[PDB]
């Protein structure tokens, strides 16, 4: 009955562990010895976008690398024009408890959700010059931690009820429900070709989901606590996960195991955001100390610091052309470094 | 600035003006966090507080040029540790306990543990606690034949339907507070009480007054 199933599960877990240990030839910290270091990158805050009156909980760049949405706890979702700092729209929300925000790849829609369990999708490019809710995707049980557009008609969401979902915006209901996690789901990130996506949970494990089939492919677990952020390598075969034990990690999708670990003895605070660079050589990471860090993704040695915030940084984004880095924080100021 | 960039800047300044007006409109109002326990019966509680001229839900109460917002986190499977830092600027929590649940399995120790957990978060340091103890008449009618002295260990008082059952439980719920800094605005609400709104107004006024004493150097 249950005993046979438990025994088979444990035996096969040992089997897969020994398997992923068999194909482990050498570390990455050795293959990247004959590489010139990048030195020290110092970046200065070129912009400072102000106008929010509370914490800023999310942020996302437009694919033209110029506009960016930002969602705050004062009931506002503002669409800044980062080049000239203007505001383009200031959408008022129905529930002011938001914890996520997204911008469509085409640039037509935006999305936001929070403690109200509902992911609202606002349509920007409409007639009547207004900005009205197109759909209100409901069906989750806990809060929504992240939500990422795929097309103008599909969206993946991840909620605190231990599930992810793939909504078809047109009809309005889940077309696929990704289950298998144990704790909450705090963050999510799509592959550059939008055929897979990784999701980080509070049970110290990240998973790789296949959008087409709808079932888990691989289960990465090397952390010691919850995972607050995740982001893919620009190549598409690696991703970085920020945890609350103050350590980022870089796993490989084909080796099925972890490659590198980024941690210093001075940093002890949790990690709120993770992002790569256009090349993927660097690695921006936000911390609770109110200062960013720029790790060297190939040698693991820290290579700079971006300290310009008074309170914890909660969102961090890199433009699609790599030309800037926006960081938001709980003092209502998000700045644009370069 | 071309002929259109000036209009874009004007639109941005109007957007920012509306942001400022809405922000000053939303600074006047106060926000309270209602955190009831399991089967503590806060449905009838909010029903009563709303009828007598009063996911996540917000109840707005207009009281004498003040606007309270009772924020009830109704349905959440989120273990309370990940979203609670949203409510770090609330004026006061509103813990809602039940008195009659010293027997159900027990149930009361769960309420004590929840209170102790919520009260020690580093987010609630500038916000007072406002206990309510619903279902008092159920305690008065139930405390007979109850032998409360076996369920809770010490209970120095009399084994009868004494007022100890009501004050002993308040002492148990107060002794879980980190002392000398925070004051707990207790209360003994029944199923058919009416002064809940007045007591909440009084406790919020006292909280603001003590915060202004601490902030205005007047101490």
């Amino acid at each position, epitope marked *: 009955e249950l005993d046979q199933l438990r025994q088979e599960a444990e035996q096969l877990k040992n089997q897969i562990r020994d398997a992923r240990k068999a194909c482990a030839d050498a570390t990455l910290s050795q293959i990247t010895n004959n590489i010139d270091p990048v030195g020290r990158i110092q970046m200065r805050t070129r912009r400072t976008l102000r106008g929010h009156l509370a914490k800023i909980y999310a942020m996302h760049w437009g694919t033209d690398s110029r506009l960016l949405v930002s969602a705050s706890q004062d009931g506002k979702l503002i669409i800044w024009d980062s080049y000239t700092t203007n505001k383009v729209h200031a959408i008022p929300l129905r529930s002011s408890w938001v914890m996520t925000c997204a911008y469509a790849p085409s640039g037509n829609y935006v999305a936001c959700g929070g403690l109200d369990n509902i992911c609202s999708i606002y349509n920007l490019k409409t*007639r009547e*010059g207004n900005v009205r809710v197109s759909r209100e995707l409901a069906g989750h049980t806990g809060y929504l931690s992240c939500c990422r557009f795929l097309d103008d008609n599909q969206i993946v969401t991840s909620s605190g009820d231990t599930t992810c979902a793939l909504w078809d915006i047109e009809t309005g209901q889940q077309t696929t429900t990704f289950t298998g996690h144990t704790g909450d789901v705090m963050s999510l990130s799509l592959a550059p070709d939008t055929r897979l996506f990784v999701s980080g949970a509070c049970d110290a494990s990240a998973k790789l989901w296949d959008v087409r089939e709808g079932m888990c492919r691989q289960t990465f677990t090397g952390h010691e606590s919850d995972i607050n952020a995740i982001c893919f390598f620009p190549n598409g075969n690696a991703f970085a996960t920020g945890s609350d034990d103050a350590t980022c990690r870089l796993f490989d999708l084909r080796a099925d195991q972890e490659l590198m670990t980024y941690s210093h003895d001075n940093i002890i605070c949790g990690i709120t955001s993770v992002s790569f660079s256009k090349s993927g050589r660097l690695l921006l990471a936000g911390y609770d100390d109110f200062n960013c860090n720029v790790w060297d993704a190939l040698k693991a040695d820290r290579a700079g610091v971006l300290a310009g915030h008074d309170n914890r940084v909660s969102c961090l984004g890199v433009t699609d052309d790599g030309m800037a880095v926006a960081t938001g924080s709980w003092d209502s100021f998000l700045k644009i470094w370069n | 600035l071309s002929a259109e960039d000036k209009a874009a800047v004007e639109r941005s300044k109007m957007i920012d003006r509306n942001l400022r007006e809405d922000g000053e409109k939303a600074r006047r109002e106060l926000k309270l966090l209602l955190l009831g326990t399991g089967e503590s019966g806060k449905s009838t509680f909010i029903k009563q507080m709303r009828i007598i001229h009063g996911g996540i839900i917000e109840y707005p109460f207009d009281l004498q040029s003040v606007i309270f917002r009772m924020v009830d986190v109704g349905g959440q499977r989120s273990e309370r540790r990940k979203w609670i830092h949203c409510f770090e600027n609330v004026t006061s929590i509103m813990f809602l306990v039940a008195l009659s649940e010293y027997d159900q399995v027990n149930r009361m120790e769960e309420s004590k543990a929840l209170f102790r957990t919520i009260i020690t978060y580093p987010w609630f340091q500038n916000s007072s606690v406002i206990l309510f103890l619903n279902k008092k008449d159920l305690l008065e009618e139930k405390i007979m034949y109850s032998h409360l002295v076996d369920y809770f260990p010490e209970y120095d008082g009399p084994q009868r339907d004494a007022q100890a059952a009501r004050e002993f439980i308040l002492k148990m719920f107060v002794d879980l507070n980190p002392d000398s800094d925070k004051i707990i605005y207790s209360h003994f609400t029944c199923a058919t009480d009416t002064e809940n709104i007045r007591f909440v107004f009084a406790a919020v006024k006292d909280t603001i007054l003590q915060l202004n004493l601490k902030e205005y150097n007047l101490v």
Partner: single-chain antibody, 230 residues
Framework: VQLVESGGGLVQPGGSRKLSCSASGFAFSSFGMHWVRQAPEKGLEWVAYISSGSGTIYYADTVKGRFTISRDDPKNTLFLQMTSLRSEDTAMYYC??????????????WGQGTTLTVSSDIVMTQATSSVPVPGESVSISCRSSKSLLHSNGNTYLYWFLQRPGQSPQLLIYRMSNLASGVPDRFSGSGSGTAFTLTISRLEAEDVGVYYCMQHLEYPLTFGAGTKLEL
């Protein structure tokens, strides 16, 4: 969305009048409105401009002082008070909406107009006056006086199409982008001070007049026009 204008009629020279445009279907409070008049057998001419919130007002140099524009947001109306009308104002006054932000398309929806009867500038020249034309590709050209390309890369030149007995509509804004609801057979291109519009596979209800407007300095000069006849 819809705009309905009212006023006009026979007016004695030197009198006064008020034109009222009622807007129904859109957020009038967020749109800057224009007035674009049109003589009987001539082309379009800018008249006045009122911003959103009435915080910015402009007029044309030939109607400066004796016209007064205003807007009423609660009632959703736009008023143009005209005083001492000369005998050269017998024109049909269209009302134009326009919203300016990064990525917007001003002048998108022009309402209908009212026909009165009163009993420097970037000179733009559409040299083509009449081009004969179905199913074949046609091209129209517009020449600007000074360079319309601004330092930020945007080139402000718009193309409008007016059919016989209708109101002109936005085809292309900023010389590259196509407006919404426009068939994909239209295209626009060119370089600084020389712009072109190319049409492929002409259909019915496509003959009309093409106007090239600039939006750089706010006298907002228009073009002469190019009628496509059969």
């Amino acid at each position: 969305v819809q705009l309905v204008e009212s006023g006009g009629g026979l007016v004695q020279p030197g009198g006064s009048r008020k034109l009222s445009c009622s807007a129904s279907g859109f957020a009038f409070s967020s749109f800057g409105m224009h007035w674009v008049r049109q003589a009987p057998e001539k082309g379009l001419e800018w008249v006045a401009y009122i911003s959103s919130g009435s915080g910015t007002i402009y007029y044309a140099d030939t109607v400066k002082g004796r016209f007064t524009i205003s807007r009423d947001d609660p009632k959703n109306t736009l008023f143009l008070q005209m005083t001492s009308l000369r005998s050269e104002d017998t024109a049909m006054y269209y009302c134009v909406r326009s919203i300016y932000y990064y990525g917007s398309s001003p002048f998108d929806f022009w309402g209908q107009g009212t026909t009165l009867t009163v009993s420097s500038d970037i000179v733009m020249t559409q040299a083509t006056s009449s081009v004969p034309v179905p199913g074949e590709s046609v091209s129209i050209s517009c020449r600007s006086s000074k360079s319309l390309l601004h330092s930020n890369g945007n080139t402000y030149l718009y193309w409008f199409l007016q059919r016989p007995g209708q109101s002109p509509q936005l085809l292309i804004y900023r010389m590259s982008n196509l407006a919404s609801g426009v068939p994909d057979r239209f295209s626009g291109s060119g370089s600084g001070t020389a712009f072109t519009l190319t049409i492929s596979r002409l259909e019915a209800e496509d003959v009309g007049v093409y106007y090239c407007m600039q939006h750089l300095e706010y006298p907002l000069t228009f073009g002469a026009g190019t009628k496509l006849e059969l």
